[PDB]
Curated annotation (Swiss-Prot):
It comes from Homo sapiens. This is Nicotinamide N-methyltransferase. One of its GO terms (biological process) is nicotinamide metabolic process. Belongs to the class I-like SAM-binding methyltransferase superfamily. NNMT/PNMT/TEMT family. The modification N6-acetyllysine is found at residue 27.
Amino acid sequence: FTSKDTYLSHFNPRDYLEKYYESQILKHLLKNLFKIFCLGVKGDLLIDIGSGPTIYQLLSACESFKEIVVTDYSDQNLQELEKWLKAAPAAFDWSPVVTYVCDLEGNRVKGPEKEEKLRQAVKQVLKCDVTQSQPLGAVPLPPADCVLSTLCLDAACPDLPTYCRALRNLGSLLKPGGFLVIMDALKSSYYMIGEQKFSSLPLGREAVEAAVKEAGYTIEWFEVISQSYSSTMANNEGLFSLVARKL
Ligand SMILES: Nc1ncnc2c1ncn2[C@@H]1O[C@H](CSCC[C@H](N)C(=O)O)[C@@H](O)[C@H]1O
Ligand SMILES: CNc1cc(C)c(C(N)=O)c[n+]1C
């Protein structure tokens, strides 16, 4: 299984964004995140776990959370995030994704307004390791109202016991009754970024549900989509989305 130090050196954030941000999946993820945050889940603080170099998973969340903390294992990934946050020239063009979210939300606001709301919400950009009892290391944070994690845990966990432990580790960042939002690939053993291969833990819906209950959460809803990534990218059998609450 891919060692975590491989994410520091061999995960190219720009290439990842070019390759995936595939469109049918992105549309579905955006609809689900809009449903969760704008049509319910809210608070003062949301922690996004394994953010990578993406901002798409935060576009509807910034309407419901005063503060958003973005986290990842890779320093290169956080640097790419910060380029967009600081509106740098070499920052990735999220404008077609931003326009799509504005349409879903009833066309209340336009693209630049949406982007400014996200940039204002993101207060901290932090290093994280989901395999650690303290994922944020020595960095102190108030208990979060919500912990979000998109397409991370399958890639970060080498086996089912580590996956369950990672869910418990994420729980330590959550207030009692706090929400856990996870969206990830089903039965995927790898994913590609050009010629670079990355391992993935191939989990079915039953193993995901069991791990979440074992980790001390109650599931509110669980959705499975049949849509898989292109043959050239991965071997997944769809994706899942779940909303759970910490016991
Ligand atoms: N142990 C670990 N702890 C935290 N993040 C990890 C990790 N191992 C890998 N990652 C991160 O998991 C990410 C997978 S890519 C997912 C990126 C983004 N959330 C999206 O939805 O597209 C990478 O950014 C990688 O750096
Ligand atoms: C689009 N990003 C993806 C896609 C897939 C299919 C997997 C996986 N777990 O195989 C991981 N990431 C990060």
